[PDB]
Nucleic acid binder design. Structure first.
Ligand SMILES: [Zn+2]
Lengths: 100, 124, 208, 55, 138, 150
RNA sequence: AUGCGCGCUAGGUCUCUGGGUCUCCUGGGGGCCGAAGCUAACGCGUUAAGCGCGCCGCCUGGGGAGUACGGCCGCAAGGC
RNA sequence: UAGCGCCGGCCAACUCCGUGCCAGCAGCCGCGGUAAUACGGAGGGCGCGAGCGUUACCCGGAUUCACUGGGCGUAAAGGGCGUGUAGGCGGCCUGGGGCGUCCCAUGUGAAAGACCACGGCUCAACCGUGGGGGAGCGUGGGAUACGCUCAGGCUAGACG
């Protein structure tokens, strides 16, 4: 069966393309603590019907481009902007971590 | 530390340091003597320890110890170098295998002949 | 390459009568009933309190010398016994007792294990009518051990098996002297043997 | 010191304790007074008389 | 801030028992009630009771001790020698049926929060379930 | 009636007016291989006197060990000072797996099958005390059920 | 030479500062002596170095050495 | 055919002769400057034995990177002190979802190796047959105590 993942949309700055942030939880191999991790997927939507903060489902698919191998299955929740804000601030904090 | 501090950073693994760098991960090396000399112990001991300054088939020139009652090592003798540090002399960390290339077995040994390589004496 | 050489010196060093010679070590000649002190120059000097390592080593050496097997074989047997079910001591002793030459000695064809080994090696002993000539052959409970037909007339065999008349063999064995044969009924138990060894020391030795 | 010794030697302890005493170390405690002659007199007299008539 | 209530309750019990107090008070909840119940049957504590302190619901635990001992240090023996918390916030311990621990060769108990309620190791093994490993007591 | 085992003797020194004065300390274990052991520490100007004193103290200070099948009812960890001892029951046919000091203590109590480990400091005196403490802290099923149930 | 927060575990005494039904009782600070306990010991002990939970920082034998090189900061000394 | 290493402690195994801070031994502690059980030889002894020792490298011992299983007042180790971002963690009561979690079934988890039981080489090593185990993933179904999420409340934390 084709893999199905669920995540928020964090970028719609491309044509017929969204960016989905998928969240994962798993015990640490050694310490047994429940670790939480994130990944970004470029999902295909030929109808431009998804925007920022839509918790959507993506499904495995035949390649569309270099980095796009997932399509958007359906919409789950809308207006969930807080997750996008959290992702943005985490990504923004990097300009503080520079050395030069 | 916290389990969080262990997840974030983990534990550093301890790596060993080779006590015999000149060998380059080999049981022995082959070298040529350049200086055959005698030196003095560190402090609580006193003697004249025989020492050979060998150049190896590696890129190393190192001092080695010549064990036994006597030797025959000249200035160009081909020798075999073995691991093992001498406690007294500060800097020598190799031995010479007696009775391989040019170093000969210590004459008239009777007890530990495998070390200080000497053939079994004829009894008749 | 078994141990070949002076024997009663082992009797002396161990300090207990190991019956490794046959008839002599029964007569007042075992060299233990006279001069029971250890061999060598410093035999009859006052002995220091032995360490734990000394105790364990000595017990193991005594047990190993009773059977006259190599250290390698002894260690292998111990590893095999340690890996099975039940008590390690009991199983180990049983496996030590399952050797062909040992069974030959027990049945009484030979006077000593050093003799049983020679009898087996020289093809004088058969198992289930098939000639077996290795001392380390492990006999299973319910095998018939007999003397080869070609080796019946040997005066050694006749003399040895004449002494078995009106003599009791181990309860885990049966003997038919007239037929010159025997049956290995079952594995011997801890109590069935009169070995002067406390195998707990052997176990403790090998654990380290 | 006496109490500690008796504890060490498994000897039962009877004591006329007061407010500043440890109830745990006494096997059989009489919670009363350690001062006031009158109290000591009463308690000891009763105990001794009981011993007397017990014999 | 109070981060772990269950660990707090266990610590309260331990601290009370170490000074031979007859009774302790703990803020009340269903989960703590379940823990106290499991402890109650096994005869560790004398028994728990629901009370109200300034309107706030509390659980009062009556503790149990051995007989008074003889000789030096006459303090009575403990019924709860040792009590720990296994699965803590920031490191949760979940065990299957196969991995359920045995405590003091069956002398002590371990409390599991299984899908079929809060049980002991013995009950869980009988029912053939696992779950969150709360604590071990002996 | 009892067997003695001598764990160690040590010669200690104190400094007088420009001189060394010596004393001897002996650590003696006393047992009957039936579940009764004592441990004694004796100091005297001379070794025999030290050994005698240690024997006396050992006989005066005994503990009962609840054996069954010649092993321990349950595992126990005991820390005395900076030294720690771990004891675990073993099935028959294991033998006594221990260092010199725990071995000597446990054999005289009649233990025939046990697994041990020493952790932290390994001073023989502290290890011996820890071992005795652990032996003093052993409970059986009957004792535990008597406490819990009544 | 004692990171921050929260909860529990005998007390006695001195002191600074609020409240009350003011002999006393109830809060918040600062000090000494000490239950249980902890510690290698000294000692700590409701102002924990006791029993627990959460998060951060740091240690891994001494000397060479806070030295060398690299990077960041500073006018420089120098700092990390 | 019987050799090889050891005999101060660790570590089983002790006397004499020779030398005299020399010659030398050494894995650590250390021996040798006149009666050396530590150097060289002899006699004895111990341990293995067609093998016995040494050098190199790995795991152990090392709880000496401590998840199981360590620590920071003085032994090495609390940041000079705040404010605070990401992260980690989080009171009481009720209901929904079943994400983590637990269970059942099933598909994998090749052979060889490992484990067990039988066998064939005169035994063994070696090999053959059979059975089971197995961390981890996929699919179907189930449970809801705990962690998560979504709703509805509460005042013991926090703030006015
Ligand atoms: Zn004999």
């Amino acid at each position: 069966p084709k893999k199905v993942l669920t995540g928020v949309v964090v970028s719609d700055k491309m044509q017929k393309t969204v960016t989905v942030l998928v969240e994962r939880q798993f015990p640490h191999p050694l310490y047994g603590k429940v670790i939480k991790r994130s990944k970004k997927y470029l999902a295909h939507d030929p109808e431009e019907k998804y925007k920022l903060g839509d918790v959507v489902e993506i499904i495995e698919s035949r390649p569309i481009s270099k980095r796009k191998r997932f399509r958007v299955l359906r919409l789950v929740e809308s207006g969930r902007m807080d997750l996008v804000e959290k992702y943005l601030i985490r990504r923004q904090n990097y300009e503080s971590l520079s050395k030069r | 530390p916290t389990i969080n501090q262990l997840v974030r950073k983990g534990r550093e693994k301890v790596r060993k340091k080779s006590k015999v760098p000149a060998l380059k991960g080999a049981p022995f090396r082959r070298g040529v003597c350049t200086v055959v000399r005698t030196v003095t112990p560190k402090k609580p001991n006193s003697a004249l320890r025989k020492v050979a300054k060998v150049r190896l088939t590696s890129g190393y020139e190192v001092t080695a110890y010549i064990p036994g009652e006597g030797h025959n090592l000249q200035e160009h003798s081909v020798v075999l170098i073995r691991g093992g540090r001498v406690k007294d002399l500060p800097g020598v960390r190799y031995h010479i295998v007696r009775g391989v290339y040019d170093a000969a077995g210590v004459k008239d040994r009777k007890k530990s002949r495998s070390k200080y390589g000497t053939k079994k004496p004829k009894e008749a | 390459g078994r141990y070949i050489g002076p024997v009663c010196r082992l009797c002396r060093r161990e300090g207990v009568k190991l019956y490794l010679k046959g008839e002599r070590c029964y007569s007042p000649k075992c060299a233990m009933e006279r001069r029971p002190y250890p061999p060598g120059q410093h035999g009859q000097k006052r002995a220091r309190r032995p360490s734990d390592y000394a105790v364990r080593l000595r017990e193991k050496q005594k047990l190993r010398r009773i059977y006259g097997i190599s250290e390698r074989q002894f260690r292998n047997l111990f590893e095999e016994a340690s890996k099975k079910k039940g008590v390690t001591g009991s199983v180990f002793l049983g496996l030590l007792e399952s050797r062909l030459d040992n069974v030959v000695y027990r049945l009484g064809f030979a006077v000593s294990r050093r003799q049983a080994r020679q009898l087996v090696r020289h093809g004088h002993i058969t198992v289930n009518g098939r000639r077996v000539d290795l001392p380390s052959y492990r006999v299973r409970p319910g095998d018939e051990i007999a003397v080869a037909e070609k080796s019946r007339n040997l005066e050694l065999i006749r003399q040895n098996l004449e002494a078995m008349k009106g003599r009791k063999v181990g309860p885990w064995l049966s003997l038919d002297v007239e037929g010159m044969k025997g049956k290995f009924l079952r594995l011997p138990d801890r109590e069935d043997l009169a070995l002067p060894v406390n195998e707990q020391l052997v176990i403790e030795f090998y654990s380290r | 010191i006496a109490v500690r010794e008796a504890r060490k030697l498994f000897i039962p302890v009877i004591a006329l304790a007061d407010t500043d005493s440890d109830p745990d170390l006494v096997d059989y405690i009489i919670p009363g007074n350690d001062d006031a002659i009158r109290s000591i007199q009463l308690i000891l007299s009763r105990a001794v008389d009981l011993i007397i008539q017990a014999r | 801030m109070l981060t772990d209530p269950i660990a707090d309750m266990l610590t309260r019990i331990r601290n009370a028992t170490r000074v031979y107090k007859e009774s302790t008070d703990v803020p009340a909840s269903r989960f703590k009630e379940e823990i106290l119940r499991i402890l109650a049957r096994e005869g560790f504590i004398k028994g728990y009771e629901r009370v109200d302190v300034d309107g706030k619901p509390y659980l009062r635990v009556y503790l149990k001790y051995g007989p008074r001992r003889q000789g030096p240090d006459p303090r009575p023996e403990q019924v709860i020698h040792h009590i720990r918390r296994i699965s803590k916030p920031g490191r949760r311990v979940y065990v299957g049926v196969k991995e359920i621990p045995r405590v003091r060769r069956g002398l002590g108990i371990a409390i599991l929060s299984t899908s079929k309620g809060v049980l002991t190791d013995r009950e869980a093994r009988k029912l053939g379930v696992g779950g969150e490993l709360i604590c071990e007591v002996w | 009636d009892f067997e003695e085992k001598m764990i160690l003797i040590r010669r200690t020194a104190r400094m007088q007016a420009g001189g060394r004065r010596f004393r001897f300390g002996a650590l003696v274990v006393v047992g009957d291989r039936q579940g009764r052991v004592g441990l004694g520490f004796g100091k005297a100007p001379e070794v025999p006197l030290a050994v005698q004193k240690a024997g006396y103290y050992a006989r005066r200070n005994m503990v009962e060990v609840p054996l069954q099948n010649g092993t321990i009812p349950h595992e126990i960890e005991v820390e005395f000072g900076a030294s720690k001892i771990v004891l675990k029951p073993a099935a028959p046919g294991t033998g006594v797996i221990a260092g010199a000091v725990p071995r000597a203590i446990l054999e005289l109590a009649g233990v025939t099958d046990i697994l041990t480990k020493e952790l932290g400091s390994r001073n023989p005196i502290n290890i011996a005390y820890a071992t005795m403490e652990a032996l003093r802290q052993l409970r059986t099923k009957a004792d535990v059920e008597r406490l819990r149930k009544g």
